[PDB]
Amino acid sequence: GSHMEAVQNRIVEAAERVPGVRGVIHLRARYVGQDIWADMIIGVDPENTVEQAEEICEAVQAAVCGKIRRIESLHVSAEAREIGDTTKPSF
Amino acid sequence: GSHMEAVQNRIVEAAERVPGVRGVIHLRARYVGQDIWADMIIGVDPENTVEQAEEICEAVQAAVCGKIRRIESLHVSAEAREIGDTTKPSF
């Protein structure tokens, strides 16, 4: 419910502190037992190479997991996001 | 079941014909009513820019949707995939 909205809000807040992150585009999260499994897609500069985005996602993984200990699993991949962009969703 | 495996097999086969696609890494698919909604993540060259991967995903969207008319919705985003890579899943 709102506790899932709350943790997702914290996921988003934490991921948006990591350099290279241009907002969270998608996020799904559920409990399996006591733990949380999340799946996220972040926005990054289109002109970044895929390798660069990948490692931005790796940092987002480390920051978000360290910040929120309930998460057992967090998958992070990326999509293109220009600065003044409204062609993709955000939080 | 295997009909969902069958359509996913066709999704994969079709998406792997599109240039820039280095295999399908993830795929989830379900019916909502009579139609199929799929979500996919493909592998692309790490050295490609994100904009380039994005448009590879756009082409994969057009090819897979045109090939399989049951799909009402297909979301495609990308991840890094080197040539001799075994650090990510495949089909």
Swiss-Prot record, chains A, B:
Domain of life of the source: Bacteria
Induction of synthesis: Part of the probable 17 gene mamAB operon.
Homology family: Belongs to the cation diffusion facilitator (CDF) transporter (TC 2.A.4) family.
Function: Essential for magnetosome formation; required for stable accumulation of MamB. May nucleate iron crystal formation. Probably binds and transports iron. Binds divalent cations, possibly up to 3 Zn(2+) per dimer in vitro, probably iron in vivo. One of 7 genes (mamLQBIEMO) able to induce magnetosome membrane biogenesis; coexpression of mamLQRBIEMO in a deletion of the 17 gene mamAB operon restores magnetosome vesicle formation but not magnetite biosynthesis.
Gene: mamM
Amino-acid positions noted as binding Fe cation 1 in the UniProt annotation, renumbered to this chain: 39, 75
Protein name: Magnetosome protein MamM
Chain positions covered by the region annotation C-terminal domain (CTD): 5-91
Disrupted-gene phenotype: Single gene disruption has no growth defects, no accumulation of magnetite, forms empty intracellular magnetosome vesicles, decreased levels of MamB, mislocation of MamC in 1-3 foci or rarely in a shortened chain. Magnetosome vesicles are fewer and smaller, aligned in a chain with the filament, only a few have very small crystals. Other, possibly precursor magnetosome vesicles are visible. MamI mislocalized to cell inner membrane or in 1 to a few patches.
Organism: Magnetospirillum gryphiswaldense (strain DSM 6361 / JCM 21280 / NBRC 15271 / MSR-1)
Binding site for Fe cation 2: 54
